[PDB]
């Protein structure tokens, strides 16, 4: 996180660049990052799964 040419992500293994949405934009990566099942329970609460 906080590295790469798309201000989102970069994987030092083979150069896959991700956008802040977790999508793959450049490199050999095949599909965009995984988006887990989740929801917010209040103003400051966030529950994943």
């Amino acid at each position: 996180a906080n590295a790469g040419d798309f201000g989102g992500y970069y994987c030092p293994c083979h150069g896959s660049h991700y956008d802040a949405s977790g999508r793959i934009r450049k490199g050999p990566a095949p599909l965009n990052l995984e988006v887990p099942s989740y929801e917010f329970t209040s103003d400051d609460m966030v529950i994943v799964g």
Binding site: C11, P12, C13, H14, G15, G27, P28, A29, P30
Partner: protein, 379 residues
Amino acid sequence: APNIRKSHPLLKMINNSLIDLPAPSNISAWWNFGSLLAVCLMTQILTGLLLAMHYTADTSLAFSSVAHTCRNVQYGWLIRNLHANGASFFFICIFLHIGRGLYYGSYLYKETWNTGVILLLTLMATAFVGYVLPWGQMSFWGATVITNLFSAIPYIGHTLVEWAWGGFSVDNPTLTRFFALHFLLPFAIAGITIIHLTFLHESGSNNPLGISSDSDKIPFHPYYSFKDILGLTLMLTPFLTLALFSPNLLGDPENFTPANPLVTPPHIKPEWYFLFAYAILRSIPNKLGGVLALAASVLILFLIPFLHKSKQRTMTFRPLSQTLFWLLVANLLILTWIGSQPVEHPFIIIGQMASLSYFTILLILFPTIGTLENKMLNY
């Protein structure tokens, strides 16, 4: 038989593969590579067998165990050092051995050659595991890609991996089951190596000129036995030098930090003896392509025998392909550098480029410069 050296079922084998074996008179050092490769197989099996005497295959104990095996066991440190390096002297010799064979068309002894590949492959395979064992940052993350690397194979892939290694993520199981493979595999290399030499003996050893040698051929023993013992000490001195003076010289230090399933090290440089294919893999942006490239990057050796066109065997009289050859050997030393190099324009392109000359030089250039030179002789 009053001989005995020939009348004894076992004893014959020896006095038939070390003594009395007809070998070409004229043979360069490039022929030792193999006898060396053996000594590695040994040094590896001996040291590792001994290092396994202290290893403890299990996440929570795996890393430390080794450390213990070093700090605690007398000369245990020396054992390790020697081992990790044999790995290299092993890949070095193998890499040279393949060289020699390539440029004397020893690949014409097909079977002896095909088996050879297998050995390489396996030696690459076994070395992949084992390095996982110490369970360092590298160990872990190498486990995770290399394995996951079979992700590419459709249908049977995602599954084959979540099996390759333990459950669903490189974790303890994968480790124990790797140790096992590692402990086991070398013994396979040993076996195949036997099969390798068998096929060889069927067809005498090659020889640098690439023309019959029956005309000469000297008794393996008196000669080559010594010659091996010599080459033994020669390319033994470096390997030892390393192991006693700058052990980790070749060993990435990043792996000295116990594995963390959560953070892959910024700057994950695979083991040197792997870089080339590594490069090829990343310079072909597509999971599958990436892998495929790689696949053939090594699995191409199998085709060299069919990509032979010269009316002559070796290429000592083929100055043309000859330099094309070094263009290759260097094109390899390049891919390597480009492999130990992060991905930016200065590189990358250089990468996929060499990672193109590579193939072509093999798949196309060679066979072309091949027939061509024959015609420059009216053939």
